[PDB]
């Protein structure tokens, strides 16, 4: 009857998900554990960039994409940054198969080489969210990275435009009701 | 005055990219990658050095996922994507998976990682295939996923990785390398190749 997220608290990509659903006003059913994976429509979608693109196209407003395809390109370029080229590189796969220790080096190496690319990008996309004033798809992928870099321990004071992009996201209603600490497979001891 | 596509033969996002502008019969000037005039462009909008970039309608995009949806938006024809929503959403997890799956996690025993990766993501691949593919990945139209798998696939070949395993990808892929955009776009036929890949 309603659709179904099969999610994971400390997954970015699940993170994505949900706020992407919060903000087109979709009710789900969370059930916790390949995820992020959506039930919807009687089909089954994987990858949080074809998932939000579907939810984009099937139910518009409010818009991921902004009209002006040169603008998508944009908003598009900043997401597959963070989905294709920041975030595998810090993958549950990588990590735990490096050491217990070799992990938080290696992240960090791959979240400031992002972050260095990202926020100079921003320096001439951003205007109050990742590109110009409305929130878009971009905005969607930065605030899970910018959490996971908090949680490597990632000093955020080199990226000024990002920090402060994520903090008026993290501002917003669907920012927070679909926040890590705020699930059913939360940890008790981290809300 | 044409698209400048910046390019590297060996890099499998450069392909998807050379396949798609192929595809949509889209002319362009390549500039293969490792002055500051050349540097300051290939930098413009892309500080981390990437390639695929290409500077089209007087801007520039990096990413080929990005890339290749601005082309099937502003070239529409011939479709990466179907009409159908939910055909889209399939053509769109396999890309997804080959592009932000399976490729990022490989740019010794550096062959023991490539391989393992290769090969779980095939498994998922082949098995979603079983029920999408006809004579391509998705039905009988070349889509988003065919312009992906290729690439991949040569990149399998290249780390040795048997496609026994894989007859639906194996099948798909030969299909698809008999279609003169993806001979024209193809790694050995560029001209940073060197010549020792010919």
């Not at 390109?73 to 990590?95: C, F």
């Not at 198969?97 to 996309?125: D, H, P, R, Y």
């Not at 993290?170 to 600490?181: D, G, I, M, N």
Request: some cysteine; hydrophobic content about 40%; aromatic content about 6%.
């Amino acid at each position: 009857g309603k659709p179904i997220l099969y999610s994971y608290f400390r997954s970015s990509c699940s993170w994505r998900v949900r706020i992407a659903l919060a903000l087109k006003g979709i009710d789900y059913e969370i059930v916790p554990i390949q995820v992020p994976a959506l039930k919807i429509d009687g089909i089954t979608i994987v990858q949080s960039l074809a998932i939000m693109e579907y939810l984009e196209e099937t139910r518009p407003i409010p818009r991921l994409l902004p009209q002006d395809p040169q603008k998508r390109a944009i908003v598009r370029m900043i997401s597959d940054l963070i989905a294709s080229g920041i975030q595998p590189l810090q993958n549950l796969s990588v990590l735990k198969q490096v050491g217990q220790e070799n992990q938080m080096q290696w992240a960090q190496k791959v979240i400031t080489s992002g972050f260095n690319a990202l926020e100079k990008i921003l320096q001439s996309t951003a205007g109050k969210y990742c590109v110009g004033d409305e929130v878009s798809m971009a905005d969607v992928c930065l605030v899970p990275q910018v959490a996971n870099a908090e949680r490597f321990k990632v000093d955020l004071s080199p990226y000024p435009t990002i920090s402060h992009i994520n903090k008026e996201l993290l501002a917003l209603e669907v920012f927070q009701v679909s926040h890590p600490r705020r699930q059913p497979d939360t940890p008790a001891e981290l809300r």
